Write a protein that holds these residues in place. Structure first.
Motif, PDB file in Angstrom:
ATOM      1  N   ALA A 330       0.793  -1.154   0.095  1.00  0.00           N
ATOM      2  CA  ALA A 330      -0.279  -0.069  -0.132  1.00  0.00           C
ATOM      3  C   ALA A 330       1.083   1.319   0.136  1.00  0.00           C
ATOM      4  O   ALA A 330       0.403   2.421  -0.110  1.00  0.00           O
ATOM      5  N   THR A 331       2.066   0.906   0.064  1.00  0.00           N
ATOM      6  CA  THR A 331       2.937   2.161  -0.123  1.00  0.00           C
ATOM      7  C   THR A 331       4.113   1.929  -1.544  1.00  0.00           C
ATOM      8  O   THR A 331       4.246   0.869  -1.751  1.00  0.00           O
ATOM      9  N   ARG A 332       4.488   2.930  -2.176  1.00  0.00           N
ATOM     10  CA  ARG A 332       5.340   2.834  -3.234  1.00  0.00           C
ATOM     11  C   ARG A 332       6.727   2.259  -2.780  1.00  0.00           C
ATOM     12  O   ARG A 332       7.159   1.225  -3.299  1.00  0.00           O
ATOM     13  N   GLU A 333       7.081   2.440  -1.454  1.00  0.00           N
ATOM     14  CA  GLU A 333       8.166   1.931  -1.130  1.00  0.00           C
ATOM     15  C   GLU A 333       8.207   0.250  -0.977  1.00  0.00           C
ATOM     16  O   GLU A 333       9.142  -0.355  -1.359  1.00  0.00           O
ATOM     17  N   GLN A 334       7.068  -0.149  -0.531  1.00  0.00           N
ATOM     18  CA  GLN A 334       6.786  -1.609  -0.423  1.00  0.00           C
ATOM     19  C   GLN A 334       6.916  -2.268  -1.864  1.00  0.00           C
ATOM     20  O   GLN A 334       7.671  -3.151  -2.017  1.00  0.00           O
ATOM     21  N   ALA A 397      10.164  -2.422 -14.162  1.00  0.00           N
ATOM     22  CA  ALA A 397       8.830  -3.021 -13.876  1.00  0.00           C
ATOM     23  C   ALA A 397       8.065  -1.938 -13.015  1.00  0.00           C
ATOM     24  O   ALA A 397       6.625  -1.809 -13.442  1.00  0.00           O
ATOM     25  N   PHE A 398       8.577  -1.307 -12.314  1.00  0.00           N
ATOM     26  CA  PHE A 398       8.005  -0.158 -11.623  1.00  0.00           C
ATOM     27  C   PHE A 398       7.450   0.766 -12.584  1.00  0.00           C
ATOM     28  O   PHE A 398       6.334   1.119 -12.663  1.00  0.00           O
ATOM     29  N   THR A 399       8.265   1.305 -13.674  1.00  0.00           N
ATOM     30  CA  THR A 399       7.988   2.152 -14.584  1.00  0.00           C
ATOM     31  C   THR A 399       6.705   1.800 -15.139  1.00  0.00           C
ATOM     32  O   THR A 399       5.887   2.707 -15.512  1.00  0.00           O
ATOM     33  N   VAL A 400       6.683   0.477 -15.913  1.00  0.00           N
ATOM     34  CA  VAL A 400       5.251   0.357 -16.485  1.00  0.00           C
ATOM     35  C   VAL A 400       4.252  -0.057 -15.822  1.00  0.00           C
ATOM     36  O   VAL A 400       3.252  -0.060 -16.260  1.00  0.00           O
ATOM     37  N   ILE A 401       4.215  -0.150 -14.388  1.00  0.00           N
ATOM     38  CA  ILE A 401       2.974  -0.253 -13.748  1.00  0.00           C
ATOM     39  C   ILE A 401       2.547   0.995 -12.910  1.00  0.00           C
ATOM     40  O   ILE A 401       1.548   0.911 -12.292  1.00  0.00           O
ATOM     41  N   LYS A 402       3.573   2.004 -12.655  1.00  0.00           N
ATOM     42  CA  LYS A 402       3.378   3.066 -11.727  1.00  0.00           C
ATOM     43  C   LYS A 402       2.097   3.715 -12.026  1.00  0.00           C
ATOM     44  O   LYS A 402       1.562   4.360 -10.925  1.00  0.00           O
ATOM     45  N   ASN A 403       1.639   3.977 -13.241  1.00  0.00           N
ATOM     46  CA  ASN A 403       0.230   4.851 -13.447  1.00  0.00           C
ATOM     47  C   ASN A 403      -0.622   3.954 -12.981  1.00  0.00           C
ATOM     48  O   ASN A 403      -2.123   4.531 -13.244  1.00  0.00           O
ATOM     49  N   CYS A 404      -0.723   2.594 -12.518  1.00  0.00           N
ATOM     50  CA  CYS A 404      -1.857   2.010 -12.128  1.00  0.00           C
ATOM     51  C   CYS A 404      -2.379   2.383 -10.593  1.00  0.00           C
ATOM     52  O   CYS A 404      -3.309   2.144 -10.141  1.00  0.00           O
ATOM     53  N   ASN A 405      -1.532   3.326 -10.222  1.00  0.00           N
ATOM     54  CA  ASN A 405      -1.582   4.073  -8.937  1.00  0.00           C
ATOM     55  C   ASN A 405      -2.630   5.014  -8.960  1.00  0.00           C
ATOM     56  O   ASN A 405      -2.521   6.085  -9.649  1.00  0.00           O
ATOM     57  N   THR A 406      -4.023   4.859  -8.217  1.00  0.00           N
ATOM     58  CA  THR A 406      -4.911   5.775  -8.101  1.00  0.00           C
ATOM     59  C   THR A 406      -4.875   6.936  -6.911  1.00  0.00           C
ATOM     60  O   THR A 406      -5.494   7.274  -6.578  1.00  0.00           O
ATOM     61  N   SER A 407      -3.732   6.861  -6.217  1.00  0.00           N
ATOM     62  CA  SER A 407      -3.372   7.545  -5.041  1.00  0.00           C
ATOM     63  C   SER A 407      -3.199   9.034  -5.345  1.00  0.00           C
ATOM     64  O   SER A 407      -2.343   9.330  -5.984  1.00  0.00           O
ATOM     65  N   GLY A 408      -3.886   9.922  -4.513  1.00  0.00           N
ATOM     66  CA  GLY A 408      -3.422  11.313  -4.447  1.00  0.00           C
ATOM     67  C   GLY A 408      -1.980  11.398  -3.852  1.00  0.00           C
ATOM     68  O   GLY A 408      -1.383  12.486  -4.263  1.00  0.00           O
ATOM     69  N   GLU A 412       2.050   6.719  -1.195  1.00  0.00           N
ATOM     70  CA  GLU A 412       1.238   5.808  -1.156  1.00  0.00           C
ATOM     71  C   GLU A 412       0.729   4.997  -2.250  1.00  0.00           C
ATOM     72  O   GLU A 412       0.809   5.598  -3.393  1.00  0.00           O
ATOM     73  N   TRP A 413      -0.023   3.755  -2.064  1.00  0.00           N
ATOM     74  CA  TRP A 413      -0.341   3.137  -3.398  1.00  0.00           C
ATOM     75  C   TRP A 413      -1.602   2.382  -3.048  1.00  0.00           C
ATOM     76  O   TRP A 413      -1.723   1.698  -2.187  1.00  0.00           O
ATOM     77  N   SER A 414      -2.492   2.916  -4.116  1.00  0.00           N
ATOM     78  CA  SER A 414      -3.826   2.378  -4.131  1.00  0.00           C
ATOM     79  C   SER A 414      -4.149   2.245  -5.356  1.00  0.00           C
ATOM     80  O   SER A 414      -3.895   2.941  -6.298  1.00  0.00           O
ATOM     81  N   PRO A 415      -5.099   1.214  -5.719  1.00  0.00           N
ATOM     82  CA  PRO A 415      -5.627   0.180  -4.695  1.00  0.00           C
ATOM     83  C   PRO A 415      -4.484  -0.619  -4.280  1.00  0.00           C
ATOM     84  O   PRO A 415      -3.469  -0.552  -4.948  1.00  0.00           O
ATOM     85  N   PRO A 416      -4.562  -1.183  -3.109  1.00  0.00           N
ATOM     86  CA  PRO A 416      -3.384  -2.308  -2.490  1.00  0.00           C
ATOM     87  C   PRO A 416      -3.232  -3.353  -3.578  1.00  0.00           C
ATOM     88  O   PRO A 416      -4.172  -3.825  -4.254  1.00  0.00           O
ATOM     89  N   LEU A 417      -1.776  -3.849  -3.677  1.00  0.00           N
ATOM     90  CA  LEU A 417      -1.595  -4.798  -4.530  1.00  0.00           C
ATOM     91  C   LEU A 417      -1.581  -6.207  -3.654  1.00  0.00           C
ATOM     92  O   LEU A 417      -1.091  -6.283  -2.583  1.00  0.00           O
TER      93      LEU A 417
END
Ligand code: DZ4
Ligand code: MG
Ligand code: MG
Length: 430
Positions: A330-334, A397-408, A412-417
């Motif tokens: 639920a966080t970018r760091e994780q 891999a982060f690069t091509v999935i990072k826009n899936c993040n709906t977080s303001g 943080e990362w939402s929705p949780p993975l």
DNA sequence: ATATGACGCT
DNA sequence: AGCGTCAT
């Protein structure tokens, strides 16, 4: 009649290791041998998840995907071995290497198709032919077939398992036309003799026992294998099919175990494989599509043409980990830290693969699952795989999935993975 | 809170 | 290309 296909052109086997991960651990730890035991993944959540079960433990009702704490309630003596954990995830290296031991022995006898970590199909047609010319007119002794069952026999005019096995083998061997080197039944029988040898060699050289099916195609071979597990092999002849399929649940047949099989049952109002014969090919195609109808039409008559693919090595190399419930990232760091963990194992295995099998992966597929979504994958994206470097792979891999993040919020990362998955694919020679 | 791999469909 | 199905 005289032009009717019977699907007897091939001799095909499916060899499957008996409770494979358990045998691997039992070989290494003699204390686990001849005991109820299971192989468990992780420990914290309810003792861990069971992914393999010895036959002694199965008699107590212990099953795969059972929690270890629950399995212990059915079987208090149950012994456990844990899957290696590396960088916070399951590491299946020991079973992959054990798998390669077995596949190398089988490959000496004939062309194999690796179908899972613990099974392969074998095309024995050529080997049967040659073995038949080296054995002209020579009757086949039952001693050459010491662990073989003939499905559907004995029939017609003893209370022990082995007694039943031998009676059927005797009836089968008595009825064989040995002079006809093109009799399909004879071919299968010779096929079974080779598989005895293959299975003897596997056990001699690895300590591992397995079962096998011997028939005319992959589907029957696979089905046959399961009929007399563990440590036995089963011959399913073309002639045995009508009775076998007559009470065979549709779902037992390979590829019919999911929605298509449920749909066959639902739409046609049948339960068993043999009931499919009363439908024309066009009827079947109209319900299930051209490909599926054609395949069903033939398959219910014991006929299937899928070839044994000459491939002993996997086509993709992959790393994945679920993050269930509370543990969902639920966080970018994780996210980034686990992409790195996955990528590092992947690098290790890619590097090993390149040295071992002289090839290089050229595409990286990233797959995630998000909280709430029940599908295996919520999203798949890919990038080039140009360097076997975990840091580059994980950043990519982060690069091509990072826009899936709906977080303001940026941290943080939402929705949780609930799943991260890295898969190297599109191999090229090296 | 049931780690991977192959393949079909569009 | 990206998703869906089926499998161990
Ligand atoms: N859904 C799953 N999830 C994770 N690992 C699995 C798995 N299914 C199997 N494995 C792992 C663990 C398994 O040991 C291995 C082979 O799977 P099988 O051939 O389906 N079952 P086994 O060989 O244990 O018993 P037998 O064949 O005698 O019935 O793959
Ligand atoms: Mg097995
Ligand atoms: Mg298997």
């Amino acid at each position: 009649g005289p032009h009717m296909a019977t699907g007897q052109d091939r001799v095909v086997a499916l060899v499957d290791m008996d409770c494979f991960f358990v045998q691997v651990e039992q070989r290494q730890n003699p204390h686990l041998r001849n005991k109820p035991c299971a192989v468990v993944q992780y420990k914290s959540w309810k003792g861990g998840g069971i992914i393999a079960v010895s036959y002694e433990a199965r008699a107590f009702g212990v099953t795969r995907s059972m929690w270890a704490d629950d399995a212990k309630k059915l079987c208090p003596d149950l012994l456990l071995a844990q899957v290696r954990e590396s960088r916070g995830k399951a590491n299946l290296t020991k079973y992959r290497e054990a798998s390669v031991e077995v596949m190398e022995i089988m490959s000496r006898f004939a062309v194999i198709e690796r179908a899972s970590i613990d099974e392969a199909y074998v095309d024995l047609t050529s080997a049967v032919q040659e073995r038949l010319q080296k054995l002209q007119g020579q009757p086949i002794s039952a001693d050459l077939l010491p662990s073989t069952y003939i499905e559907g026999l004995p029939q017609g005019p003893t209370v022990q398992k082995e007694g039943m096995r031998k009676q059927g083998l005797f009836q089968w061997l008595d009825s064989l036309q040995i002079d006809n080197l093109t009799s399909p039944d004879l071919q299968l029988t010779v096929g079974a003799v080779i598989v005895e040898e293959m299975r003897a060699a596997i056990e001699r050289e690895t300590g591992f026992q397995c079962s096998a099916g011997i028939s005319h195609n992959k589907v029957l071979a696979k089905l046959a294998c399961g009929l007399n597990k563990p440590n036995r092999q089963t011959l399913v002849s073309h002639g045995s099919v009508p009775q076998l399929f007559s009470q065979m649940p549709i779902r037992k047949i390979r590829s019919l175990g999911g929605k298509l099989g449920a749909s066959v049952i639902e739409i046609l109002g049948i339960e068993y494989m043999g009931e499919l014969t009363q439908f024309t090919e066009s009827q079947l195609q109209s319900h299930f599509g051209e490909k599926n109808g054609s395949w069903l039409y033939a398959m219910c008559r014991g006929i299937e043409h899928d070839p044994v693919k000459p491939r002993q090595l996997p086509k993709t190399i992959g790393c994945s980990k679920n993050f269930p419930g509370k543990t969902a990232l639920a966080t970018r760091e994780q996210v980034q830290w686990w992409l790195l963990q996955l990528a590092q194992e992947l690098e290790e295995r890619l590097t090993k693969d390149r040295n071992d099998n002289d090839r290089v992966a050229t595409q990286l597929v990233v797959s995630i699952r998000v909280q709430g979504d029940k599908r295996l994958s919520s999203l798949r994206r890919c990038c080039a795989l140009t360097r076997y470097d975990a840091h580059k792979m994980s950043h990519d891999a982060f690069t091509v999935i990072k826009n899936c993040n709906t977080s303001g919020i940026q941290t943080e990362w939402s929705p949780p993975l609930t799943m991260l998955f890295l898969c190297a694919t599109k191999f090229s020679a090296s």
